[PDB]
Structure formats: structure tokens, C-alpha cells
Design a protein around this motif. Sequence first.
Motif, PDB file in Angstrom:
ATOM      1  N   UNK A 156      41.065  31.216  49.950  1.00 56.66           N
ATOM      2  CA  UNK A 156      40.312  32.452  50.192  1.00 56.66           C
ATOM      3  C   UNK A 156      39.982  33.136  48.868  1.00 56.66           C
ATOM      4  N   UNK A 157      38.732  33.567  48.718  1.00 63.30           N
ATOM      5  CA  UNK A 157      38.276  34.252  47.509  1.00 63.30           C
ATOM      6  C   UNK A 157      37.271  35.361  47.851  1.00 63.30           C
ATOM      7  N   UNK A 158      37.308  36.475  47.115  1.00 61.01           N
ATOM      8  CA  UNK A 158      36.308  37.541  47.260  1.00 61.01           C
ATOM      9  C   UNK A 158      35.618  37.801  45.921  1.00 61.01           C
ATOM     10  N   UNK A 159      34.317  38.090  45.952  1.00 58.93           N
ATOM     11  CA  UNK A 159      33.534  38.331  44.725  1.00 58.93           C
ATOM     12  C   UNK A 159      33.850  39.659  44.040  1.00 58.93           C
ATOM     13  N   UNK A 160      33.790  40.751  44.800  1.00 58.60           N
ATOM     14  CA  UNK A 160      33.845  42.112  44.248  1.00 58.60           C
ATOM     15  C   UNK A 160      34.972  42.947  44.856  1.00 58.60           C
ATOM     16  N   UNK A 161      35.323  44.025  44.158  1.00 54.66           N
ATOM     17  CA  UNK A 161      36.368  44.959  44.583  1.00 54.66           C
ATOM     18  C   UNK A 161      35.748  46.219  45.189  1.00 54.66           C
ATOM     19  N   UNK A 162      36.353  46.708  46.267  1.00 55.04           N
ATOM     20  CA  UNK A 162      36.004  48.004  46.850  1.00 55.04           C
ATOM     21  C   UNK A 162      36.686  49.157  46.107  1.00 55.04           C
ATOM     22  N   UNK A 163      37.883  48.902  45.579  1.00 56.13           N
ATOM     23  CA  UNK A 163      38.628  49.900  44.798  1.00 56.13           C
ATOM     24  C   UNK A 163      38.028  50.202  43.414  1.00 56.13           C
ATOM     25  N   UNK A 164      37.373  49.221  42.788  1.00 56.81           N
ATOM     26  CA  UNK A 164      36.908  49.367  41.401  1.00 56.81           C
ATOM     27  C   UNK A 164      35.673  48.531  41.050  1.00 56.81           C
ATOM     28  N   UNK A 165      35.122  48.793  39.866  1.00 59.39           N
ATOM     29  CA  UNK A 165      34.008  48.018  39.317  1.00 59.39           C
ATOM     30  C   UNK A 165      34.497  46.654  38.833  1.00 59.39           C
ATOM     31  N   UNK A 166      33.553  45.779  38.497  1.00 60.75           N
ATOM     32  CA  UNK A 166      33.850  44.432  38.002  1.00 60.75           C
ATOM     33  C   UNK A 166      33.826  43.382  39.101  1.00 60.75           C
ATOM     34  N   UNK A 167      34.057  42.134  38.702  1.00 59.80           N
ATOM     35  CA  UNK A 167      33.974  40.971  39.589  1.00 59.80           C
ATOM     36  C   UNK A 167      35.255  40.133  39.508  1.00 59.80           C
ATOM     37  N   UNK A 168      35.342  39.113  40.357  1.00 59.69           N
ATOM     38  CA  UNK A 168      36.563  38.330  40.528  1.00 59.69           C
ATOM     39  C   UNK A 168      36.318  36.829  40.340  1.00 59.69           C
ATOM     40  N   UNK A 169      35.280  36.469  39.582  1.00 60.06           N
ATOM     41  CA  UNK A 169      34.937  35.055  39.362  1.00 60.06           C
ATOM     42  C   UNK A 169      36.019  34.304  38.563  1.00 60.06           C
ATOM     43  N   UNK A 170      36.721  35.009  37.669  1.00 57.25           N
ATOM     44  CA  UNK A 170      37.858  34.434  36.921  1.00 57.25           C
ATOM     45  C   UNK A 170      38.859  33.673  37.800  1.00 57.25           C
ATOM     46  N   UNK A 171      39.167  34.234  38.969  1.00 56.20           N
ATOM     47  CA  UNK A 171      40.156  33.666  39.895  1.00 56.20           C
ATOM     48  C   UNK A 171      39.526  32.852  41.026  1.00 56.20           C
ATOM     49  N   UNK A 172      38.311  32.338  40.817  1.00 53.03           N
ATOM     50  CA  UNK A 172      37.678  31.463  41.794  1.00 53.03           C
ATOM     51  C   UNK A 172      38.488  30.158  41.834  1.00 53.03           C
ATOM     52  N   UNK A 173      38.884  29.693  43.043  1.00 53.00           N
ATOM     53  CA  UNK A 173      39.792  28.537  43.137  1.00 53.00           C
ATOM     54  C   UNK A 173      39.313  27.307  42.366  1.00 53.00           C
ATOM     55  N   UNK A 174      40.261  26.567  41.795  1.00 50.78           N
ATOM     56  CA  UNK A 174      39.949  25.364  41.028  1.00 50.78           C
ATOM     57  C   UNK A 174      39.343  24.269  41.905  1.00 50.78           C
ATOM     58  N   UNK A 175      38.229  23.725  41.433  1.00 55.49           N
ATOM     59  CA  UNK A 175      37.548  22.595  42.068  1.00 55.49           C
ATOM     60  C   UNK A 175      36.436  22.126  41.134  1.00 55.49           C
ATOM     61  N   UNK A 182      32.148  38.608  50.123  1.00 54.80           N
ATOM     62  CA  UNK A 182      31.502  39.354  49.041  1.00 54.80           C
ATOM     63  C   UNK A 182      32.452  40.391  48.456  1.00 54.80           C
ATOM     64  N   UNK A 183      33.168  41.100  49.330  1.00 56.28           N
ATOM     65  CA  UNK A 183      34.067  42.193  48.939  1.00 56.28           C
ATOM     66  C   UNK A 183      35.464  41.961  49.522  1.00 56.28           C
ATOM     67  N   UNK A 184      36.487  42.520  48.873  1.00 61.09           N
ATOM     68  CA  UNK A 184      37.874  42.430  49.380  1.00 61.09           C
ATOM     69  C   UNK A 184      38.108  43.185  50.699  1.00 61.09           C
ATOM     70  N   UNK A 185      37.306  44.222  50.947  1.00 58.98           N
ATOM     71  CA  UNK A 185      37.301  44.939  52.230  1.00 58.98           C
ATOM     72  C   UNK A 185      36.142  44.521  53.164  1.00 58.98           C
ATOM     73  N   UNK A 186      35.598  43.313  52.978  1.00 61.17           N
ATOM     74  CA  UNK A 186      34.510  42.801  53.827  1.00 61.17           C
ATOM     75  C   UNK A 186      35.028  42.672  55.260  1.00 61.17           C
ATOM     76  N   UNK A 187      34.168  43.022  56.213  1.00 64.71           N
ATOM     77  CA  UNK A 187      34.588  43.324  57.583  1.00 64.71           C
ATOM     78  C   UNK A 187      35.083  42.087  58.328  1.00 64.71           C
TER      79      UNK A 187
END
Lengths: 233, 215
Positions: free
Chosen positions: A181-200, A161-166
Motif C-alpha cells: 500500500x502506498x499514498x502519493x500526498x499527505x493531508x496533514x502537510x505539504x510535499x509528496x511520498x514518492x521516496x517510499x514507493x515500494x521497491x520493484x 492519491x492521499x493518505x486520507x483518501x476515502x
Amino acid sequence: KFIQNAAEIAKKAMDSVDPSLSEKFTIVIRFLTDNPDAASALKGKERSIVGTEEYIIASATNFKKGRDPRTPLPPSTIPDEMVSVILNKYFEVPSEELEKAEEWHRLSMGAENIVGDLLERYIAEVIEPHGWIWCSGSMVRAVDFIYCDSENVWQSLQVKNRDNTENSSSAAIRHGTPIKKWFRTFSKKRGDNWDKFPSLEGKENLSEKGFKLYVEKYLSALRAIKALEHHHH
Amino acid sequence: NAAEIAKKAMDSVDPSLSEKFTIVIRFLTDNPDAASTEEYIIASATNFKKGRDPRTPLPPSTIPDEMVSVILNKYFEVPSEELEKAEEWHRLSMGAENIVGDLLERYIAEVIEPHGWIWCSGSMVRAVDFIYCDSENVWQSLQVKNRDNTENSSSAAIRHGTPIKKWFRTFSKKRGDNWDKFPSLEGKENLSEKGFKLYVEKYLSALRAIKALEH
Ligand SMILES: [Ca+2]
Ligand SMILES: [Ca+2]
């Protein structure tokens, strides 16, 4: 390592449990036979050793269990009264709303502890039509999704879910490409990371709006289910 | 001469703690697994002193997960207009939770340090939070936790002394407090759930007054 007839065990095990999952589960077992370092002991059912027939059969129930709907659950930990003293006496939260703040804190921790699971469910609904398999329950370590591609090469995917997920995890791949490996959200900042979801195949479907719509649908359905429980008592 | 090195280091940083810090350095010389050369002891002196600075309750800096508000709204029926308020009170509760353990140590420190116990301030001592050199020169050690299941726990071996008296304030699964089982030692009689509450209210009252005069 896995036994001599691992696949045939898996098939009949899941036929007793849920015939609609049998094919997908059989492929998960095959994936773990080729890639044994991704095999994990079953949580709550560690009595069965990774690789034995007994583990395969227990994994079948576990794999299905994992797919049953979870209810959002606030923890049963009784809250500290001194938390309320600090909210009242430092943060100037009105004294009559302290009980409310205490409950919403607990609901917020319950919300937090199911969002990771709903993320997997959303992704599974989108990518399982195309042949990917959500590795539900705990029998697979590090990998959340698998796919035997058109070249008969194992693909594998981890989501957080997060880049700092435990719970970070890694497992060695004997046969296949590296774990994506992919994470949805950032702990450092707002916004999401769906743009870089691996190709498939199906990737274009996946987004934060998609995930938000899946969650509204899943919680609406679940609310309606618990309404029918009170009518059936 | 680690005691003399410990004395000098703390005379540089804060002479009011030089006596207490030296006795803590003596404790780690006898029980080195609790330790978290001369340079280590200079560094420690700052750490130990830092732990005694008044600490403000701070909500986490972290960015909230937007989906948590959705789940609050759509599952638990929290109104649209109250979601931001819920988000903030959650942050505030975590900041309150993040300091209660510290306030608990300071309260106990206020009571038992006059009887010759020493608060192991900062994070130079693994696990153990207070220590004492009794009349026959044996190390009694005390480890305090806010909850019985309190999120993280770090542990150390006792090489020379009596075992680590362990104790927690509150229960995860039931209401109330556990002050009745607080370890035997000088000043135990003045420690209670009411003493702690009073100490916290006076502590926060004083912080608020400091924040008023600043801005
Ligand atoms: Ca993971
Ligand atoms: Ca997983």
C-alpha cells in the motif's frame, strides 16, 4: 470462486475486444482465480456473478473501458446560490466575479476527481513495460497493480492519491505476498511520498516530476483530441 | 427521572435552553434509535448548547493537491497568474458549502421555535432536526437537508409518533428551490427562499461587524 477453464474464456473474450490486452487480462483472471477475495462485481454490470463465464466476458470490456482516456469533468450538480451569497457577504469576493468563482470551484472538483485516475495511468506507463499489470476498470478490489515475479509469486500493489483518501480497501491474499500500500500526498502537510514507493523493477523512474510531466502530456494530447472533434463535428 | 436530570444538567450549562432540552430528552425517551444513564444527559446538554453558538464560515485547513492547479491550467486554460486565486476561491466555496446547512437550520429555528417547535441543536439527535408535541401529545419530527443529494445522510427509526417528515431546500439537477413542499406546521407560511437569503445576509453582516471590532 472461478470456473474450470477461466483462462481460455479470458483469452478469446479480450481477443474480440482488444488483442493487445489479451495476455495481460488472462494473467489478471489467473490472479483472481488464485486470489478470489480480490474479485469484485463489475460497476454498472452487476447482473453477471463474480467467477462465471459471463462475468469474465463482461470483465474484458470493463478492463479495456478502464483504459480509454477520461476527460476532466466538472460535476453537473447545479451550484447553490447561497454559496455565492456567503462568498460575497462574508468573504468579500467581488459580486461580478461570483459566477467565475462558481465555475472554477466546479472545475477544481473536476480536477480533484480525475487525479486519482491519472496517478494510476502514470504508474502504468512506467511499470507495464517491466511486466506489472494495471488492473483497470473495477473487476479487482483493493489491488491496483499485479505482477507474477521471477519466482512465480504474485506481487500486488494498491495506490491512493492521499493518505486520507476515502475509498480504503483490503482483500485477502491466498497465494502471494501482502498487498503493498502506498499514498502519493499527505493531508496533514505539504510535499509528496514518492521516496517510499515500494521497491520493484522501474521504481527509480517514478517521481512527482514524472507524474507532473505525464499529466501535462495526457491533458495536451486530450485537448488536441477534442480540437479534432470540432473539425469532424 | 430523566426529565429532572435533563433539567438540572441544562441549568448548569445554559438555563435559557433547559425547557427545550428537557422536551428533546422526552422525545428520545420515546424514540431511543434517534439517540446518537445520567452521564449521557449531562454530556448532551453541552452538545445541544454548543450547536446554538454562532459558527464562523471557515475554509478547510487541508493542503491543496498541486496537480489540481496543473489540470486547471493545462486542461481548462486558467492562466498561471490566476491559479492561486482559483485555489483560494475553491477553499472558500467549500467553507461556504460546509455552513449553509447550519444557516438553514438556524433560519428555520428562528421562525418555527416561537410556535413551540424545538431545534435539535448539535449532533445528539440522529437524522431529525426539529420536533414538536402537538395538542394530542404526539411527536411530529422534521428532517432538513440543503440539497436532495446532500453528501452525507444519517437515519433513525420512529418508535412512537408520526413518520419523519423529510424535506430538502434545493435540487442537484435543476435550478430553483423546493420551499413549496415544506411540511405543514405553525409558521410554515413565513418560510421561503427569500426569507432564508435575507436571514443569511443579516447573519453574515452581524458576524463581519463582530470581526471588525475584534481586530
Ligand atoms: Ca484503492
Ligand atoms: Ca482499482
